[PDB]
């Protein structure tokens, strides 16, 4: 099974450098050209370079749009491909995929890793403020929690420590103009249950080592 | 560079129907150097077709690619539930390698109007000097919807943000949140807060409201 495990991503300041690693396994790494492709949030795919096999000279090609800020290298003895990114800009925020270039006369991108998120921002690392969204229909009531002003992604939200999963919607985060993220998690329940049942949202933000439990009352 | 323009932007089709996706190149591309990729939300792309017409390993027969010159086509003849995804074309015969902007093939289900809920700000948040008011549109299809905020029956055009879920993998619906954020001072200048929702499945707008401090 082809594996392309990207690592080295995460939060980086504007203007700084970051080196991504692609640890490959399950194939003869030295035989193949390798390529990096990125995807900014909500956007399409953009090629950001490839490197040829040693047998084919081992040299790279990069798109002019990156303005020579990126360098691709490879270590065949460790089966690792690298993407060195310099002078990073907020526009470089994206999921970065490592890919294997197929052999032969049609060199498509045959295999893709999961990708690693690179976030280029100067925002403060902080846990969210968690506020209840209080229920107040036609037999169905909605409640939730507002998970406001955290950075960076991700946060994880559960309800009643995972005992409540049916009807839950945790919305994709929105980047506020402040540079911090916000989202809401909601759940629909029978209106008849509001007077008696207990609903607690659990919010975990690992980058800030924060864990919050909030009881949501009518 | 070679610009790849895909059409249409979004294709809404029922399982069993045929999907035809177009990819147009700003200049001619040898068919040997055109590929198609499938990507689902939260997942990496995967190769479908290379060399305009050759299926990658494990790709079912219902996928076929064709074309030449500046015009390439991906046909999915009898859509299965797992075929609904975004599809990207790519050329690798000219430097730089470029991708199209993608075509979303979404699963079409019967129309469902949203259920609407409104949430006032919490007492805890108000103590901090900010008031967030949230409007929820739950379990609707198709995706297009409009949310308008009215404050003391006056249309409020600013200070709001929206978030939409991906299409639900079980019932193929969408949900949407709209969050109006004001300072505590501005929030206390008005009595009635309301969100008004339209959707092609609603014959007329649906309003939910509350009175500040009740």
């Amino acid at each position: 099974e082809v594996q392309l495990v990207e690592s080295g991503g995460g939060l980086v300041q504007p203007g700084r450098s970051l080196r991504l690693s692609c640890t490959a396994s399950g194939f003869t790494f030295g035989d193949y050209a390798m390529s990096w492709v990125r995807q900014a949030p909500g956007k399409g795919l953009e090629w950001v370079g490839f490197i040829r096999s040693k047998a084919n000279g081992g040299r790279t090609e990069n798109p002019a749009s990156v303005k020579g800020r990126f360098t691709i290298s490879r270590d065949d003895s460790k089966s690792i491909a690298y993407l060195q990114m310099n002078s990073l800009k907020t526009e470089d925020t994206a999921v970065y995929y490592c890919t294997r270039v197929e052999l032969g006369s049609s060199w498509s991108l045959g295999y893709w890793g999961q990708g690693t998120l690179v976030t280029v921002s100067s925002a403060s690392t902080k846990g969210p403020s968690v506020f209840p969204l209080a229920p107040s229909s036609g037999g169905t009531a909605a409640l939730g929690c507002l998970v406001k002003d955290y950075f960076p992604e991700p946060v994880t939200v559960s309800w009643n420590s995972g005992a409540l999963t049916s009807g839950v919607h945790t919305f994709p985060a929105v980047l506020q103009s402040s540079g911090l993220y916000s989202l809401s998690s909601v759940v629909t329940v029978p209106s008849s249950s509001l007077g008696t049942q207990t609903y607690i949202c659990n919010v975990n933000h690992k980058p800030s080592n924060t864990k919050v439990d909030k009881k949501v009352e009518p | 560079e070679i610009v790849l323009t895909q059409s249409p932007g979004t294709l809404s089709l029922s399982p069993g129907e045929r999907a035809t996706l177009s990819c147009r190149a700003s200049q001619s591309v040898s068919s040997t150097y055109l590929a198609w990729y499938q990507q689902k939300p939260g997942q990496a792309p995967r190769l479908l077709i290379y060399g305009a017409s050759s299926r990658a390993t494990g790709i079912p027969d219902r996928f076929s690619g064709s074309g030449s010159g500046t015009d390439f086509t991906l046909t999915i003849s009898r859509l299965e539930p797992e075929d609904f995804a975004v599809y990207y074309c790519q050329q690798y015969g000219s430097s730089p390698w470029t991708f199209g902007q993608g075509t979303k093939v979404e699963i079409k289900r019967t129309v469902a109007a949203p259920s609407v809920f409104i949430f006032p700000p919490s007492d805890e948040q108000l103590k901090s000097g900010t008031a967030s008011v949230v409007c929820l549109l739950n379990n609707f299809y198709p995706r297009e919807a409009k949310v308008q905020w009215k404050v003391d029956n006056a249309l409020q055009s600013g200070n709001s943000q929206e978030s939409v879920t991906e299409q639900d993998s079980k019932d193929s619906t969408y949900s949407l949140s709209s969050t109006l954020t004001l300072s505590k001072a501005d929030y206390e200048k008005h009595k009635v807060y309301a969100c008004e929702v339209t959707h092609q499945g609603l014959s007329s707008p649906v309003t939910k409201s509350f009175n500040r401090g009740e």
């Binding site: 050209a33 390529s35 490839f50 490197i51 040829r52 096999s53 084919n56 000279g57 040299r59 090609e61 990069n62 270039v101 052999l103 032969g104 006369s105 060199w107 | 150097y33 690798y92 015969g93 000219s94 430097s95 730089p96 390698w97």
Partner: peptide, 10 residues
């Protein structure tokens, strides 16, 4: 640039 990654251009 040279778009062929499976051959030595230089």
């Amino acid at each position: 640039g040279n778009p062929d990654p499976n051959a030595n251009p230089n």
